């Protein structure tokens, strides 16, 4: 019968669009997740904390060593830890069916990821979590266990399966976790829109809204 907790849900279409992102430089490798959508990769801005890394993108449909990331057109969601990267024409695109929306206080979320195997990928899903908005920011708190490496993993509503955000932050001592929410009309405004792209974008933490957080970088 109907009960407190939601029943079985299919997260596989989300998992099919999750990518591994490696930004490699002399003496440092940034390893995060991303979300593919058409010719676009959606990632954290902090993937590009370090300039001029060689970017490798692993997907269910191939592995793409795009090399120097500074040549790529990018579109930041200004004020929050999300960036959209446009791939070259020779990068085979993802489908364009995922739904994105802002979270609400009705939502609970599961983290979704992917494992890469020889002939296939497999889907991974976490326990569901309550969420709490961090005032004057795009950050929402969640309680799902994460390791360094899991930034960029989608947080998915168990109400309607929409992607609400991607993992971003952890507290430096108490282990609290935070994801960054997608804005309203994200696909229409950032993906479908022909304008607003550039190659000369550089990461600046000061351009993200922090509210009462102090970022330790």
């Amino acid at each position: 019968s109907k009960a407190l907790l939601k029943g079985v849900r299919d997260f596989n279409p989300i998992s099919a669009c999750v990518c591994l992102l490696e930004n490699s430089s002399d003496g440092h490798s940034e390893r995060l997740f991303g979300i593919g959508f058409g010719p676009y990769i959606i990632a954290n801005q902090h993937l590009f904390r370090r300039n001029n890394g060689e970017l490798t993108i692993k997907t269910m449909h191939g592995e793409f060593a795009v090399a120097n990331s500074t040549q790529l057109q990018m579109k930041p969601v200004e004020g929050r830890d999300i960036i959209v990267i446009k791939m070259a024409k020779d990068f085979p695109p993802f489908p364009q069916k995922l739904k994105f929306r802002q979270p609400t206080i009705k939502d609970r979320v599961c983290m979704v990821s992917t494992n890469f195997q020889q002939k296939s990928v497999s889907s991974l899903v976490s326990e569901s979590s309550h969420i709490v908005h961090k005032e004057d920011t795009s950050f929402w708190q969640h309680w799902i266990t994460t390791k360094d490496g899991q930034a960029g993993s989608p947080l998915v509503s168990i109400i309607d399966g929409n992607i609400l955000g991607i993992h971003s932050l952890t507290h430096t001592t108490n282990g609290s976790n935070y994801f960054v929410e997608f804005p309203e009309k994200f696909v229409a405004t950032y993906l479908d829109a022909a304008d607003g792209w550039c190659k000369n974008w550089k990461f600046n933490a000061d351009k993200i809204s922090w509210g009462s957080f102090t970022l330790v970088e």
Binding site: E30, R31, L32, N44, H46, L47, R49, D81, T146, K147, D148, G149, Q150, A151, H167, S168, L169, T170, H171, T172, T173, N177, Y178, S212, F213, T214, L215, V216, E217
Partner: peptide, 7 residues
């Protein structure tokens, strides 16, 4: 308070 990118 004090936070870091999880990367």
């Amino acid at each position: 308070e004090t936070v870091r990118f999880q990367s």
